[model samples]
Target: NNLGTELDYDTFCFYYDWYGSEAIDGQYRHWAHAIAPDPNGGSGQNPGTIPGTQESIASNFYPQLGRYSSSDPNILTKHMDMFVMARTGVLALTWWNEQDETEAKRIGLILDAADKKKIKVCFHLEPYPSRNVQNLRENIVKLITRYGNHPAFYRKDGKPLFFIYDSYLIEPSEWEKLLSPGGSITIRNTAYDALMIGLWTSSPTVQRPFILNAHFDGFYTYFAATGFTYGSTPTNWVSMQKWAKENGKIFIPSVGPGYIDTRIRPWNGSVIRTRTDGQYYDAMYRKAIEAGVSAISITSFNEWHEGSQIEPAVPYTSSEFTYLDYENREPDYYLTRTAYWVGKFRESK
Candidate 1:
């Protein structure tokens, strides 16, 4: 079966770590400290220091997982089950680097869990301080050598696929050296070669010259709130899709329920985007489907800090913190909505 023939289309969701506890118990083990819970006796405007646990970290939204560790098998299994229920095909995991012993070990466990649930996994290459063309080559080689054969590792046209976040950090000339067919260290005709998806943002422009210059297989917008950037706007997807098809590349549009990150960036409360009871999500998905792209991505599955997570969130409030609730809606509202959309997308075939 050809690549897109079997599935027709696919959906992937971003996953993040907030529960902190990791496999290796590194210094950053309890790393959820970044998001301060609501301040005491205030309207969550005054930031307050809170513990790193699920119950402690401050956010406008709460995760149903409830202060669980990221490396917990139960948590991982539950997440997989939720994705399966939602008919989501892939989990785009945020990874720092190959040397991240904690995350590296955790990835193994995640892969095993995903395999059991029949869910695919892909790497969302984060912009590590040492990330560059040379290091990226080494990192990808390691990834393919270690996990390429895994049943759950996402693939396209017989090659593993990778989503490179902040790919613009490296110059186009440098990426060409690794991705372009004619440049030195080119992945073409090599065991390390993979389908590379670069991140695009409209803050600069939607032209995305890097897709051609760097030889990217595709481009994607990670942000969910549309009005913030040009790449995130749904109206622009049609034009972008046309451009991608003309250039022999893919354009993946990302959709999210809503956005809010005041817990992490105290001064950035003005950037909030209300969920409006799934209407926001529907619009984005509708645009992506109408654009006729090969795939669609979601902003996140469990990035609770940003409040874009679709995972079930329990309502909570405390003397020093307050969190969002589903009100009369069930905790799995988003999950049910996702399943509906997935069914809709499949029906389009």
Candidate 2:
């Protein structure tokens, strides 16, 4: 636990695709993803399935506003309201790559919208096709040069904070070349310098190299399912937090309402986690707080495919399958609960 008088707890929510319609492109983007059929003779989508068909979408939960595009002024405005209502400090955008023009434009719209509220924007740099240190450097320069100065950009310690997803895919030696202060191609103290956070997919013991050797400033556990990975298990977070404190690293433990992706990957029922009438989320929140986290990240605001989203869900039954709801709770119930915990976290520190 922190001995300080106050904690700089940033409530972050990983926000994936906001595209809900074909308005921005020739076809439906994220919402039209083809869901795999259940191996055990359950609901599934075929390859020839029409893209815009609603029942064929790849989520077990239906969007509160249906498949609405964030490009639309109303949808973007509504998302802003939700983030503000949740008292979320940062919205971590899943960034694919710098080559994608659509993503660039969408991020611009999001940043503009966030400026209207108290929320800040951070980038969860995804492991895109052929991601490497050189290109990552260029992308960082591009992102910071384009949007870094914006008031909505989340900044701490006079620098932007970023999360590098699957950061372990690359060898630590390669990362050190870019992250080490005195190494070749280092970004430290440069215009592209940032408080870069790497992912912890395994135990903290095995993951320490990413921070110490690779020069990462912190570690964040992204998986919401406990025991799915050592990093995700709440029992492990206390040790991870203590390690971070002793080593001067940031520890962000991500929590979610629950984990369930049976609608899309029906055969994987063994991993399903029930919401248990919101108690699951409550317990997870308690763990994050008790671990003495530097920050608490919500696995997602709208990762509907994984069924871990805190975004509003609606109970609906199409001919294909039945979608899950918040167990008689209000659609925005998670947002309200998150805000409550955020207040409680503030009071705790």
Candidate 3:
């Protein structure tokens, strides 16, 4: 089984699809938003501007997708192939709300492609406007009703899996009403029963007791900037695992190649963690194994805004912005490295 108190050797990656042609004010948002026009008046829509951001926005280390569409079947197939080669079992897709018609349709394309690659899909529920217990209940209902029948929809013990992002925004009491066994809007032991995993950060304000009280089945750290918080710190993973085991909860610690969001959050440049040519990822995987975590999660597969994406990125440069390459290695270096770690993880399990 993929879910249990013991290690299940399952690996999941956070995925994003907020970029689009018509979604963000008609400009090529996310892809070329951070870039500026070429000083030499370069041709084409991209213009090949510098790689860094202007304001406090984070820039991508990779080049722009150039108004690429996520709904494209070829792009979706490429993603599926990469994840399959990495041996990742799940893709936790980001979702804003029930009204996200575009993302909902994109989910179908992703599920269809992932099903072909034998990968599963899970929802990473974002904190949309007025996101509350009641809305969350309704969202879950809609999610299951619409896409639950898909072969790629991730399920554990006959229940769909959902990753609750920014779960701390909601009060524990409110979550209890939905997650607890016998509360007003209880999901447990009901038609809406699900494997809900909440986001857990190292902030002192958020204690493990709150997670238990909220009745969350498990918790995961989604950030790749290791040591930025206690939960993301490698040394603390063992303690987190111990607590999860003691409380009969599953611990899915997140690992990443590195973190660099200077383009999006310029003030947060100090939080940058170099990939060190994959050593950072290797160490993270080793720590997760050492902690005997129930599962391991990766920060992203294509979160280019934060540069946490492990997707293939070719070396690129522009008159204004020059980006970092994969240390003269191929674009698929991270993906191949991930396959190595996945093999080791399975062998250990």
Candidate 4:
């Protein structure tokens, strides 16, 4: 099937944590997050997943790639291909900051890989140190200046896209200066200007003011916890979409397979969003389609610690914990389901 072409640009996946101990860097970067959880919230914490032991990791499930390095050409290439197969047109990488030269090099590689697969890549801006309006402006300048010309640097409405994590942490006035065209230091109409999306959490009342007052281009619920937040709940998407249309802003309701991060947050059962095989995914996708959305962003493609990734995983066990699987289904079933839902969305369109 020569079904390869420019992908559905609006379809996106939140991607992150592309590092490991291997040939690419010769040292573990992110995989060490497996630091064994401490009950006291203090000492007695054994930094687990200690480089060598495969089973001693933080995630409740192990990846099919098995702690692969993000800098590796093969890993990046394979991930791009997988996203293409999953029908994901855009990948929102969890970007930290400009200080990390390794990230700059890896992002360059990622763009190249994504371009080869005919997909796009964007930045999911994380709250790095000294994060503020001025910091954002300067960082955008650096990023766009460096990679804006790349064919795979995902852009919409003739500009790049940025999804800000926990954007509410910054005051509305602070954002106004950056996002509002009329405000001083605003990036609007500049070469650094891009579609800036903010995280909407809990309820409309809680986040609407920040998004509207701050002049965010749009809002999305980064959490996979359905019903836990107005933005994350599919039932609220249509109404939210209506409100967005009225305000001339975009509302992206992010969906995910499930959530179960007991290994990382041992006291998080009350917050677990169960993935009922593929039924949960189907129900959420149905709502987004019915909501008449122009785009849909998955909570993640590989955010394993939060337990919301659609990346392939296999069953495994260790002396301390037993890893989760796809309920005995194919390891790559989420990719299949993602393609199915994406197709259905296109069909509805």
Candidate 5:
């Protein structure tokens, strides 16, 4: 088949806990370049991403307010070299859900600079709401013009592709209006040209025929409660990938090293652990590659709260402090395994 494509990552977030160069808690906390989630709330109301509250930081680490200025290209280069060494061409930065346009651009500037010389940064844009088809098309065109030529733009087929985290969040009529590209159009000042959405929760149960009907480039295969967890041994993702591939859809396979919910608020479900062993994790990646995925996204780069983060850290090993001694496994090790499988799988075909 010789069908394997190179691996791409959704993120390579620098967790404040790994690089320890930045000062925290009046001391040099190790992995300071590993950007920590803001205590003031970078994860939004869900807070489940990093899965902790302001009180959690205040009580233990006393994460100082607004100090993660580790955005220097030199710092990023060091980190990105590690990402490149891990064998990936894309790095999607985290925490853009609630950011305003100005803040988004600020983040974009950082990504733009990184793309100038190093790895391409995939800017995950927030979806702009619209009620008219003409306005929506105009918005899409404008977005393409704004950043389309940027070195980091994500492309599909031949056109640059953007991702909106919530694809089905709009109303049915509004959805139609969005895809139609007609009507008395009014453009507000937001900078997005036309951000196509990433399917955040598109399990068959949700049944968003409009989303599939509108025929957005790709449909995210799973969503919370609607899709399988490790225990359930999720089904049909490979089938979905096959369908996407045959239809000229870009298939983005989302991978996770493991799952955890220890940081969840009381109401959230009990912690769920999947990929308890490396073989299972490796198998999933191999399957996704064989299924004809053009790109693969790790569930997260440093989602410490959900226990999906690949950044090396240990909650139990207080005795070890060095980067090597960090308790949890490094995602790089597993990702390397994934890359190996990808190459081998492709070679086999």
Candidate 6:
């Protein structure tokens, strides 16, 4: 494991996959062509499902060597073990509700499988609800209680944590009333939940959503730490932390390596920087720690589409230009290098 050393690196994010890394052929690919729904179904929004192909290819920036075969329980379990032990306490998966029952079932089955081993599965409340709000809530509650107590579920102040991406999208006044209907449908009858609200491009000054009559444990600023030069800054972090302290909320300072996703979308900007090598990661990480961030929320652990997968890939690929592969000594061997920095950060703190 960590060789008895403090892992500021463990403060580092972790990801999950179904299989061990395979040498070539784009190991561990997405279930679908991209973010689209899997036509064959049953696979959720996994990167593995393609329309005509039998094998699912990961992101264009897929780890040159890593593979996530969701079909193999052993594989998934192994990866989960690594994530829980080595990474921070939180684990956020990318299963959006864009899938049909088959896809839902696969995710459910995975959760069910995980439940057998006491692994909790936490789902990000869809930022923009597209499906039947009633049904979606019902299914979500059922899913949460089914495995709510698992170690993998999000928790803060000793309770399950539920996150919402956009506060404005939420119907503030009736939010709790609207979402509560599903609580009754779950096996637990009543759901005791915690909330983390996210802000969008146009940040609203309001801290809590209108729905809750009670104070939430925390307020996390979305898109705060992920952007490169645009949204990330020391002043902004200080401002947000001030807001959190004033409101008596636990502020979770989020961190991300950066972003560069022009290929899939029409956006022209890319956050790729020449100076942000091994030294940059350490610098930023230490900055967050110095900011007194008790729990860091990274932009992602494995979001390869935007060229942001932290998994350790062996060989080099165009898709993996931005990834932090631990196997190879690229630009800088990130994992071990990170361990060195993290250990130092821990001691310094």
Off by over 4 Å in 4: 1-6, 34-52
Total clashes in model 6, counting residue pairs 3 or more apart in sequence or in different chains: 22
Report the C-alpha lDDT of model 4 over 135-249, residue by residue, as the tens digit: 8888889889988989998888788989999898899999999999987998988878888988888677867787888999998887887787667878888888898898999
lDDT of 3: 0.78
For 1-349, candidate 2 gives per-residue lDDT tens digits of 5532222337788998646676656566667665566666735535243254577566778888887776676787888888877878789999888576666778888998888875789999999889999999989998899998888998887888889999999888989988899869999989889988999888556888667988898888888776788888888888899899998888988998888876556677777888888898899889999998868889889888888988888888888767788987999999888888887777674
> lDDT, candidate 4, residue 53?
45
Q: List the residue pairs that clash in candidate 2.
A: none
Scored against the true structure, residue 166 in model 1 reaches a CA lDDT of 85
**TM-score: the better of candidates 2 and 6:** 2
Candidate No. with top lDDT: 4
The superposed Cα distance between candidate 1 and the true structure at residue 312, in angstroms, equals: 0.6
Q: What does the lDDT read for residue 146 in candidate 2?
A: 92
lDDT score at residue 59, model 4, on the 0-100 scale: 76
Is 1 or 3 the stronger prediction by lDDT?
A: 1
* TM, every model: 0.89, 0.92, 0.87, 0.92, 0.63, 0.65
**lDDT for each candidate structure:** 0.79, 0.82, 0.78, 0.82, 0.45, 0.45
lDDT assessment of candidate 5: 0.45
Tens-digit lDDT track for model 5 on 123-151?
A: 44435444234554554565567656776
Which parts of model 6 are misplaced by more than 4 Å? 1-60, 64-67, 81-85, 98-121, 131-140, 149-154, 176-190, 200-216, 222-234, 273-275, 317-349
